[PDB]
Write a protein that binds this ligand. Structure first.
Ligand code: CLA
Ligand code: CLA
Ligand code: CLA
Ligand code: CLA
Ligand code: CLA
Ligand SMILES: CC1=C(/C=C/C(C)=C/C=C/C(C)=C/C=C/C=C(C)/C=C/C=C(C)/C=C/C2=C(C)CCCC2(C)C)C(C)(C)CCC1
Ligand SMILES: CCCCCCCCCCCCO[C@@H]1O[C@H](CO)[C@@H](O[C@H]2O[C@H](CO)[C@@H](O)[C@H](O)[C@H]2O)[C@H](O)[C@H]1O
Lengths: 50, 120
């Protein structure tokens, strides 16, 4: 048993599975990035900037 | 010169009659003779839609809009007598013709404004 709060330790020396991990975080933050954008475009009212 | 198989599809059928830069002439109005208008054409080019008041009474302007239909805008074949009543002024009286076209333009924001472009 490895504790749950350590599961991600399996990468401390796997530059491949680390870059793989890091690649997935970036991918998610972009998803969210454009994701958010769309949500806002789908609800932003431009009719009055005053 | 240009015929149907000559205009079909070119969309020239919507644009109407031009006068080569030779104009600036003067069509003598007899007054002792009755005049009529054979063909009066009206070709739309730009449509504007006064931005609904903001509520805040601050002079609303007419903004441009995108034509969501196609080249189905021109009024043509319009005719009627060009009456020459006293004091030299002319008065055209529309009698009949393709004097109306349902146009729909997509506005700046998102809306779609359908109007009945006419001169009935
Ligand atoms: C810069 C980013 C960063 C990175 C890459 C790491 C990386 C690491 N941390 Mg560290 N950590 C960080 C920031 C970071 N930490 C911060 C800011 C704190 C203070 C809160 C800590 C506190 C901390 C502790 C106390 C421990 C680690 C441990 C570890 C190692 C294993 C992690 C694990 O098992 O996760 C697996 C985790 C889970 C199964 C639970 C996740 C639960 C949270 C509450 C859910 C939140 C979810 C949500 C999606 C997150 C959004 C993130 C937000 C910032 C946008 C790993 C090397 C462990 C270690 O050293 O192991 C020997 C360990 O015990 N970290
Ligand atoms: C988005 C960033 C992120 C990334 C890149 C990783 C990456 C990794 N995880 Mg971690 N994990 C994350 C978030 C992330 N995790 C979160 C938020 C949790 C819950 C708190 C966990 C809980 C977790 C566990 C329990 C385990 C891993 C394990 C692993 C490793 C193997 C792949 C796997 O089986 O995943 C499993 C995938 C998940 C549990 C993700 C569920 C996500 C849903 C859709 C959203 C909620 C890999 C290094 C395994 C390991 O330690 O390898 C030996 C393992 O057993 N992860
Ligand atoms: C030639 C020089 C060089 C360059 C330009 C980079 C560039 C980069 N490194 Mg790498 N690195 C290098 C040498 C280099 N490294 C060496 C010698 C090592 C030791 C083995 C490492 C070890 C290393 C680690 C351990 C990590 C990085 C990471 C990263 C990225 C961080 C920023 C990011 O994620 O942007 C976000 C992405 C973009 C918007 C850019 C996408 C476009 C790229 C440039 C093209 C990808 C296609 C190309 C054909 C193949 C990849 C080439 C590779 C050299 C990067 C970035 C792309 C991190 C990572 O994994 O990133 C996710 C990371 O954790 N690097
Ligand atoms: C520069 C800014 C930045 C930084 C430094 C980080 C850093 C981190 N991110 Mg985050 N992320 C960011 C921006 C950033 N992110 C953005 C803009 C998004 C888009 C919304 C995400 C989305 C994201 C996701 C979807 C995931 C991460 C995860 C992670 C952690 C991965 C490593 C790890 O194992 O941690 C170990 C864990 C920790 C120390 C996290 C606790 C720290 C935060 C601050 C607490 C948040 C509190 C939370 C609401 C309380 C829940 C409690 C629970 C009991 C109910 C790391 C702490 C992964 C993760 O946390 O999985 C384990 C993950 O799945 N990030
Ligand atoms: C390919 C390149 C690329 C480009 C051109 C953009 C462009 C944009 N992004 Mg996206 N983004 C990218 C990749 C890219 N992104 C990637 C790979 C991710 C992760 C998946 C994201 C995640 C992301 C998020 C989460 C968000 C954006 C947002 C935005 C918009 C502007 C926001 C802003 O002001 O950021 C400014 C950023 C910074 C302050 C970065 C500089 C960081 C510090 C100051 C420097 C640290 C430097 C370090 C210490 C080195 C030393 C420096 C040395 C010279 C001395 C902009 C359209 C925002 C938006 O509006 O969403 C639509 C937003 O919220 N992006
Ligand atoms: C099968 C196949 C394939 C593949 C696949 C792939 C590659 C996939 C991917 C996938 C993916 C990649 C997926 C993803 C998913 C996602 C999700 C599921 C998300 C979600 C999200 C959310 C839920 C959100 C939210 C929100 C809101 C609500 C608002 C605000 C903002 C936000 C956005 C945050 C190929 C092409 C080869 C071909 C053959 C077939
Ligand atoms: C090929 C790359 C593709 C990239 C992704 C592009 C996606 C573009 C989506 C943008 C977000 C649209 O968000 C959506 O906007 C339209 C207006 O335009 C809104 O439409 C709203 O006003 C129109 C009138 O203008 C009403 O007829 C409609 O019933 C009402 O919901 C939607 O309520 C909103 O949910």
């Amino acid at each position: 048993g490895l504790p749950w709060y350590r599961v991600h330790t399996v990468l401390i020396n796997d530059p491949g599975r680390l870059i793989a991990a890091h690649l997935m975080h970036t991918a998610l933050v972009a998803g969210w990035a454009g994701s958010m954008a769309l949500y806002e475009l789908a609800t932003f009212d431009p009719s009055d900037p005053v | 010169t240009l015929t149907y198989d000559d205009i079909v599809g070119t969309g020239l059928a919507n644009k109407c009659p031009t006068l080569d830069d030779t104009a600036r002439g003067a069509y003598p109005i007899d007054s002792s003779q009755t005049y009529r208008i054979a063909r009066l054409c009206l070709q739309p080019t730009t449509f504007l839609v006064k931005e609904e008041p903001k509520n805040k009474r601050q002079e609303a302007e007419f903004v441009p809009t995108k034509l969501v239909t196609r080249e189905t805008t021109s009024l043509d074949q319009i005719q009627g007598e060009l009456k020459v009543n006293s004091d030299g002024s002319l008065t055209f009286v529309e009698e009949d013709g393709i004097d109306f076209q349902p146009v729909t333009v997509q506005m700046a924001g998102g809306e779609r404004i359908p109007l009945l472009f006419t001169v009935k």
